[PDB]
Amino acid sequence: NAQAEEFKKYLETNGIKPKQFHKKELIFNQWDPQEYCIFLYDGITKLTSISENGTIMNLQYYKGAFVIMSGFIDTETSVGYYNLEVISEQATVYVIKINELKELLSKNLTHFFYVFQTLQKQVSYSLAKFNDFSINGKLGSICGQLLILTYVYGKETPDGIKITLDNLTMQELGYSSGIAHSSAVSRIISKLKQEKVIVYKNSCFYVQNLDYLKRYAPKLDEWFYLACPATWGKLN
Amino acid sequence: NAQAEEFKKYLETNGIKPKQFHKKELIFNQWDPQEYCIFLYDGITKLTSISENGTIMNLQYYKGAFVIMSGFIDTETSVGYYNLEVISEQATVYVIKINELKELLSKNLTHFFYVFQTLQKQVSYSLAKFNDFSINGKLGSICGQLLILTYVYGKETPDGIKITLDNLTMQELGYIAHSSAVSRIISKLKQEKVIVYKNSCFYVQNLDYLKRYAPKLDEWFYLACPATWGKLN
Ligand code: NA
Ligand code: NA
Ligand code: NA
């Protein structure tokens, strides 16, 4: 990712050093009024909101390289009461107080535009997820998350396209698909195994009918085509 | 909206003339190879998509002043096969090809920040909507839509918060097109006197009910539009 590598160099040039966070840590949290720009260089995170009774809502997932901003660039105040939780074993992030970010994007407009484009990717991703759910419901949701994982992490094996993630849990897959309880995920994962679309072997999902996933997540497939054409092309 | 007025003046300063569109016209469409930045100065629009059947899906609504970009700012290519359709009688828009937007935002970072912040508001809005649907389902979505009409178009009166939007437009925004499930939810809120018809107008009489079932969109409006939130709270 050439833009992300150039942005990394720009940050280090300007004294911003990488930080390692481990699984379950909150890079930023919903109770902290100091807001941040997070450059997630490596690893997997999720945006959450925690209710007063302790229920955790999973709102969005991100993988490095990406940018997540907890405050508005102009007002420096919260864009929502959100946490950014590490779900990979480790994540590498560059943390920039929001008051400092304006200065930096101001002096290099190439990187201003790299960060702008990431917001556009979020917005359109959310719309595509909404569109697929409206058409195909929870099946579309789960098919879409399996599809993106296949594009990003898939490896061709004799067993199918293996999604090469450690501890890709049934529960985390449902959360990324907007489904909060395991009953609905089991029923759909059951149908997908029954119809021989996926298989579960060495703690990993293998995709054996990629066309089926594309069929039921058409707007997320189109999002990936439009936003990540080189990666989309590996399996089309 | 002071920031938006400054942006309008900056566009005109750089030679960009407003265009007028009418209800049901497309400001941009999903088939055009060229992408645009739309400064929607006045009016109401919706983002639409089409499945293979020819079925139209309503994805998002925008009211002036706002910024809608159909392509990525760096690559200038589509962010999605989307159309932008006018819902009000008329809309006033400024249309900027994406390559020219970058030159404009480069030269005045105040305006760069304005467009960047509007994109941040859009991102958080989508997440708030998703959070409220995930908690309260279609009731959360509908209460959220009604909550935004109340905050954006509402004025306090002795009969409640009058929605100061023409009745034609206001029925559309309350809501794929014309879901029976949505109609039943809306008419249940009316039946329960959350929103009431009186002397040719509609009045929100139970704002607390809307806030209860769209709590994340309520927080979004407090954080993103605090002065508009404050008027009615
Ligand atoms: Na925070
Ligand atoms: Na277009
Ligand atoms: Na107030």
Author numbering:
A (entry chain B): 2 to 237
B (entry chain A): 2 to 176, 180 to 237
Excerpt from the publication:
PrfAWT is a homodimer in which each monomer consists of an N-terminal domain (residues 1 to 108) and a C-terminal DNA-binding domain (residues 138 to 237) linked by a long α-helix (αC, residues 109 to 137).
In addition, we found three new PrfA mutants in the remaining three strains—Leu to His substitution at residue 140 (PrfAL140H), Ala to Gly substitution at residue 218 (PrfAA218G), and Ala to Val substitution at residue 94 (PrfAA94V). The results were consistent with the fosfomycin sensitivity test—all the prfA mutant strains showed significantly increased hpt expression compared to the wild-type strain, with the A94V substitution having a minute increase in hpt expression. Based on these data, we hypothesize that the original A94V transposon mutant carried a secondary site mutation, allowing it to grow in medium having G-6-P as the sole carbon source. Hence, the new mutant structures display features characteristic of both the inactive and active forms of PrfA. The PrfAA94V protein also had one folded HTH and one unfolded (WT) motif identical to that of the PrfA* mutants. Thus, the new structures of PrfA* variants and the wild-type-like PrfAA94V protein, presented here, represent an intermediately activated form of the protein. The most striking structural difference between the inactive, intermediate-active, and fully active structures is the position of their recognition helices. When superimposed on monomer B, the recognition helix in monomer A is shifted up to 6 Å.
